[PDB]
Ligand binder design. Structure first.
Ligand SMILES: C[C@@H](NC(=O)C(=O)O)C(=O)O
Ligand SMILES: C[C@@H](NC(=O)C(=O)O)C(=O)O
Ligand SMILES: [Mn+2]
Ligand SMILES: [Mn+2]
Lengths: 308, 308
């Protein structure tokens, strides 16, 4: 055993005896700003709040209503064959990290495509900071309890509507994430940052899903300025069915499972690994806040260097 | 570099670029409980608040006022020949970590010995108390702005009165510390936990000061039932006259210096390295709160493994 491995082992033993990030706290009432800063944000600790929101949206937002209120606008939608946009797929003997086919279609067309169990996997992800009627269905002020710890306005606000086959593979974000399911449920698999050395990562060629004239889906590699291949580091394990023979270290990881229902709020702290499934035609909005750096971030950068 | 050295280099370079623990924040107005939680407790960041307290004690507490008010009670006093209780000292060619001689004597005797420059170094530490005449002169609720981040009662409340020659060598505490100078000033040299690799530690035999039949001070080694010598890991650097030839890594440290005056409050975050000096007959009261574990403690234990 090298010194790096004994360091990582001490880290893990200490976190296991202390059960750091060993569960997702569950609340029935929204906390106060002070409670949220002290108990969750300051400990980099996730929490789910049940039936927290009574926004109009939660009862009225569906595909049909959305087309109605949004004047059946054209949308930017993401399509894949396997349902793993930003995920791993093999082609011609080569494993790629593949981005979605991003095309434009009328909301109604999306709703027809989601209703086809045999078709491709579609989802809509829109980012910003008709939208006013949608905004009339929301009271963002109600998230003050969390926002006061971040002490800045959301750097992004995302709306999500898609197919149950759309699976978001395990990744980490540099954001505090306040996640509000509107219609349906989202299933999260969470892993704390300090378990980095238990989550196998590889370097993969970058590809994008593309349609042919015939209509069959294929992967096209990506190039840089010079024309050389672009690469992407990514988590190699599949939380839903992990290959522990190929990835023994993942045996030491301790994923947490949480289902977030309509009206619930999930706080996903920055740099937590998350893998997301969902229910068919689930609608959700989340709010991304740029993180404030402290020693934890420098420790995690050190951890990234120790996990070559 | 070795793998571990490169890891440490990343940690320090990140923290340097991001100004982590790079200064003591200075406030002229007391923060709200939420501001304190968000800016200092949760970042593990020191802050000093100037002229923050209006306690009646700030003004009148002196050894004289204390004798007249307390009625020349007998108290526990700590005595050393060198002014370094819990500090390194050599004897017969061996370096020891040495505990004060602890004795009982009357306040008027301590005041008399505090006026003997030729005498040994004396200081009173009282751990906890509720005295009619003196609990009336403070108002601990005034510290709630910080106590609410800790959400617990103090583990200990220390009263300190000592000689200018009484120097507290550099060490770390498992507590959040709210430090309140009542009279005089205290000088702190602070180093953030993540700079551990820059702070040399050694393992030293443990001793306690004793006086011989003729009045000479000497170091008595500490032993257990088995008769084996007891040992203590201790910081080997002296931040007042640091020997960078012996400890080159200490040049990569960035110690912060702060003077806490009568009425000032200093938040010393948990596990921060501190070294303390004081003006003559300085009086101070501090509140320790057990720390709340999260990943930073585990990273710190890993750092300890990496630097040994
Ligand atoms: C794609 C995914 N969201 C995130 O990964 C996130 O909000 O960070 C989802 O909710 O399906
Ligand atoms: C002994 C020292 N206090 C501490 O070391 C502390 O409060 O942690 C002092 O007040 O000089
Ligand atoms: Mn994400
Ligand atoms: Mn201390």
């Amino acid at each position: 055993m090298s010194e790096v491995e004994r360091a990582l082992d001490v880290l893990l033993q200490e976190a296991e005896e202390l059960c750091i990030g060993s569960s997702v706290v569950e609340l029935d009432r929204i906390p106060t700003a002070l409670e949220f800063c002290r108990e969750f944000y300051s400990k980099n600790q996730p929490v789910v709040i049940r039936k927290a929101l009574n926004w109009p949206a939660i009862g009225k937002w569906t595909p049909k209503y959305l087309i109605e209120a949004l004047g059946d606008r054209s949308v930017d939608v993401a399509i894949t064959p396997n349902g793993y946009a930003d995920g791993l797929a093999t082609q011609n003997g080569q494993e790629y990290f593949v981005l979605p086919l991003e095309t434009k279609m009328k909301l109604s067309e999306v709703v027809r495509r989601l209703d086809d169990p045999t078709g491709a996997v579609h989802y809509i992800q829109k980012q910003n900071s008709d939208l006013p009627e949608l905004a009339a269905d929301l009271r963002v002020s109600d998230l003050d309890f969390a926002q006061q710890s971040f002490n800045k306005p959301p750097d992004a606000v995302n709306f999500w509507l898609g197919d149950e086959r759309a699976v978001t593979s395990m990744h980490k974000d540099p954001y505090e994430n306040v996640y509000c399911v509107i219609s349906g449920h989202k299933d999260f698999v969470l892993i704390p940052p300090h378990q980095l050395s238990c989550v196998p990562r590889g370097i993969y060629p970058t590809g994008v899903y593309k349609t042919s004239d015939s209509g069959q889906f294929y992967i096209e590699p990506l190039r840089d300025e010079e024309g050389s291949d672009q690469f992407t580091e990514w988590v190699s394990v599949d939380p839903l069915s992990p290959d522990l023979a190929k990835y023994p270290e993942y045996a030491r990881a301790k994923p947490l499972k949480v289902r977030v229902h309509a009206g619930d709020i999930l706080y996903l702290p920055n740099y937590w690994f998350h893998h997301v499934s969902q229910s068919h035609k689930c609608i959700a909005v989340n709010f991304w806040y740029d993180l404030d750096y402290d020693s934890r971030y420098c420790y995690y950068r050190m951890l990234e260097q120790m996990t070559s």
